[PDB]
Amino acid sequence: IQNNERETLVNSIKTAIQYSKIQAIHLGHPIYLLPFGSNENWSRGMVLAKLNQTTNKTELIHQWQWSSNSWNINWKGVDSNHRIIISNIPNRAMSNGKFILNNKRTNEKVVVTLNRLGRVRVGGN
Structure with missing residues (x-):
């Protein structure tokens, strides 16, 4: 019995930006990964949305909604804009x-590092 709902908010936030880096490169234009209900915090899920440049409307592609209300998703982004612009190119x-996940009734903190860079720092001695 290992029903740990901790790593299901890590392996589903590092796998909800890797499915969107193909919804950009396959439309020749960037897309907007927003939080679910982008007027509070990223703590009710995330939604991959694209703008249709011929009917000026935000089309919802995918919806990841956290069915466990015990992880405060706190985005330590260096941008006061809760919109992750996924460029339609791999580099x-x-x-x-x-994303700093915090369970405030069983003091646990899980830092999701978006270290999506396979380029090894080959250099130095």
């Missing part, structure tokens, strides 16, 4: 920030 699509 210009990293929004510097990390």
Whole structure:
């Protein structure tokens, strides 16, 4: 019995930006990964939404809604804009920030590092 609902808010936030870096490169234009209900906090899920440049409307593609209300998703982004712009190219699509998950009734803190960079720092001695 290992029903740990901790790593299901990590393996579903590092796998809800990797499914969207293909919904950009496959439309030749960037997309907007917003929090679910973007007028409070990223703590009610995330929604991948694209803008249709011929009917000026935000089309919802995917919805990840956290069915466990015990993880305060706090985005330490260096941007006061809760909109992760996924560039439609594999080498210009990293929004510097990390989701700090905090369970405030069993003091646990889980830092989701978006270290989506396979380029090894080969250098030095």
